[PDB]
Amino acid sequence: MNIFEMLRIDEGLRLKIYKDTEGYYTIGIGHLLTKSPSLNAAKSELDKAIGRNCNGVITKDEAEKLFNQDVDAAVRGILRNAKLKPVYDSLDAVRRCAAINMVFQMGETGVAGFTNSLRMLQQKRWDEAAVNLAKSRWYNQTPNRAKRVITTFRTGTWDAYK
């Protein structure tokens, strides 16, 4: 188990443009293309990302390459963020995967309201952090996935994915 397998489970793999849980055009392993309602805008973003004229369809190799870039971008964003980096560095490797998972799904902006949860995680108050993480739009809108990520923070194991 590693961050790539974890997010592959949570995001799936689709080779044609689809809509994510929020209704936004996406492709591959959860690669968000645009929040615009325009499919043409999504197709342009896809072509820019892949470097060829795709008309909404990619290969599995292309999906896996985008995914690697997206995971790396989430990590580097955490490491450049003065609020996220100290909490991330305080965590063990399994819990760091849960942190990347959240940033992948909601971005630095979406995690901005998790300040109290982050403090509890840095304090290693795992059950309290787990309860607090569930008091969120995130948990209410994607409960099965949030439950897996929260269990990973609570236990420091891969039990929710195994």
Coordinates of C-alpha atoms in Angstrom, one line a residue:
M1 CA 0.0 0.0 0.0
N2 CA 1.1 3.5 -1.0
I3 CA -0.4 6.8 -2.0
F4 CA -0.8 5.8 -5.6
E5 CA -2.7 2.6 -4.8
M6 CA -4.8 4.4 -2.2
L7 CA -5.9 7.2 -4.6
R8 CA -6.4 4.7 -7.4
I9 CA -8.9 2.9 -5.2
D10 CA -10.6 6.1 -4.2
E11 CA -10.7 7.7 -7.7
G12 CA -11.0 4.8 -10.1
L13 CA -9.7 4.9 -13.7
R14 CA -11.7 6.3 -16.6
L15 CA -10.2 7.0 -20.0
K16 CA -12.9 9.3 -21.3
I17 CA -14.1 12.7 -19.8
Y18 CA -16.5 12.1 -17.0
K19 CA -18.1 14.2 -14.2
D20 CA -16.7 13.9 -10.7
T21 CA -18.8 13.8 -7.5
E22 CA -19.3 17.6 -7.7
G23 CA -20.4 17.5 -11.3
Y24 CA -17.1 18.8 -12.7
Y25 CA -15.4 17.5 -15.9
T26 CA -12.6 15.1 -15.0
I27 CA -10.6 12.3 -16.6
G28 CA -8.2 9.5 -15.8
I29 CA -7.6 8.8 -12.1
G30 CA -9.5 11.9 -10.8
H31 CA -7.7 14.5 -12.8
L32 CA -10.0 17.6 -12.6
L33 CA -10.1 19.4 -15.9
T34 CA -12.3 22.4 -15.2
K35 CA -15.2 23.7 -13.1
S36 CA -16.7 25.3 -16.2
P37 CA -20.0 23.8 -17.6
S38 CA -18.4 23.9 -21.1
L39 CA -17.3 20.5 -22.4
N40 CA -15.2 22.3 -25.0
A41 CA -13.4 24.1 -22.2
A42 CA -12.7 20.7 -20.5
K43 CA -11.5 19.3 -23.8
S44 CA -9.1 22.2 -24.3
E45 CA -7.7 21.7 -20.7
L46 CA -7.2 18.0 -21.6
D47 CA -5.3 18.7 -24.8
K48 CA -3.1 21.2 -22.9
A49 CA -2.4 18.6 -20.2
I50 CA -1.6 15.7 -22.6
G51 CA 0.2 17.6 -25.3
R52 CA -2.0 16.4 -28.2
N53 CA -5.5 16.7 -29.6
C54 CA -7.3 14.0 -27.6
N55 CA -11.0 14.9 -28.2
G56 CA -11.9 13.7 -24.7
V57 CA -10.1 10.3 -24.6
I58 CA -6.7 9.3 -23.3
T59 CA -4.7 6.1 -22.9
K60 CA -4.0 4.3 -19.7
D61 CA -0.3 5.3 -19.9
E62 CA -1.4 8.9 -20.2
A63 CA -3.8 8.6 -17.3
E64 CA -1.1 7.2 -15.1
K65 CA 1.4 9.9 -16.0
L66 CA -1.1 12.7 -15.2
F67 CA -1.8 10.9 -12.0
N68 CA 1.9 10.8 -11.0
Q69 CA 2.1 14.6 -11.7
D70 CA -1.1 15.2 -9.7
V71 CA 0.2 13.3 -6.7
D72 CA 3.5 15.1 -6.8
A73 CA 1.8 18.5 -7.1
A74 CA -0.3 17.7 -4.0
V75 CA 2.9 16.8 -2.0
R76 CA 4.8 19.9 -3.2
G77 CA 1.8 22.1 -2.4
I78 CA 1.8 20.7 1.2
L79 CA 5.5 21.3 1.5
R80 CA 5.2 24.9 0.3
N81 CA 2.3 25.7 2.7
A82 CA 3.3 27.1 6.0
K83 CA 0.1 25.8 7.7
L84 CA 0.2 22.3 6.2
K85 CA 4.0 21.5 6.2
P86 CA 4.5 21.3 10.0
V87 CA 1.5 19.0 10.5
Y88 CA 2.5 16.8 7.5
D89 CA 6.1 16.5 8.8
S90 CA 4.7 15.5 12.2
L91 CA 3.0 12.4 10.7
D92 CA 4.1 8.9 10.0
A93 CA 4.2 7.7 6.4
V94 CA 0.7 6.1 6.4
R95 CA -1.0 9.1 7.8
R96 CA 0.9 11.3 5.3
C97 CA -0.9 9.3 2.6
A98 CA -4.2 10.3 4.2
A99 CA -3.1 13.9 4.2
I100 CA -2.1 13.8 0.5
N101 CA -5.4 12.1 -0.3
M102 CA -7.3 15.1 1.2
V103 CA -5.2 17.7 -0.7
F104 CA -5.7 15.7 -3.9
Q105 CA -9.5 15.7 -3.5
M106 CA -10.1 19.2 -2.2
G107 CA -6.9 21.2 -2.8
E108 CA -5.2 23.5 -0.3
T109 CA -8.2 25.8 -0.4
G110 CA -10.6 22.9 0.5
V111 CA -8.5 21.9 3.5
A112 CA -8.2 25.4 4.8
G113 CA -11.1 25.0 7.2
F114 CA -9.6 21.9 8.8
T115 CA -7.4 24.0 11.1
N116 CA -8.7 22.4 14.3
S117 CA -8.5 18.9 12.8
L118 CA -4.9 19.6 11.8
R119 CA -4.0 20.7 15.3
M120 CA -5.5 17.5 16.7
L121 CA -3.5 15.5 14.2
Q122 CA -0.3 17.3 15.1
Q123 CA -1.1 16.5 18.8
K124 CA -1.6 12.8 17.8
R125 CA -5.1 12.9 19.4
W126 CA -6.3 10.4 16.8
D127 CA -9.8 9.6 18.0
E128 CA -10.6 13.3 18.6
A129 CA -9.1 14.2 15.2
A130 CA -11.3 11.5 13.6
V131 CA -14.5 12.8 15.2
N132 CA -13.6 16.3 14.2
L133 CA -12.7 15.4 10.6
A134 CA -16.2 13.9 10.1
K135 CA -17.9 17.2 11.1
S136 CA -17.4 18.5 7.5
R137 CA -19.1 19.0 4.2
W138 CA -16.4 16.6 2.9
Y139 CA -17.6 13.7 5.1
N140 CA -21.2 14.4 4.4
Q141 CA -20.8 14.5 0.6
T142 CA -18.3 11.6 0.2
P143 CA -18.8 9.6 3.4
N144 CA -17.4 6.2 2.2
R145 CA -14.2 7.8 1.0
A146 CA -13.9 10.1 3.9
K147 CA -14.5 7.2 6.3
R148 CA -11.5 5.4 4.7
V149 CA -9.3 8.4 4.9
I150 CA -10.4 9.1 8.5
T151 CA -9.8 5.5 9.5
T152 CA -6.3 5.8 8.1
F153 CA -5.7 8.9 10.2
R154 CA -7.2 7.2 13.3
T155 CA -5.3 4.0 13.1
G156 CA -2.1 4.7 11.1
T157 CA -2.9 1.4 9.2
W158 CA -4.2 0.5 5.8
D159 CA -7.1 -1.5 7.3
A160 CA -9.8 0.6 5.5
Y161 CA -8.2 -0.1 2.1
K162 CA -7.3 -3.8 2.7

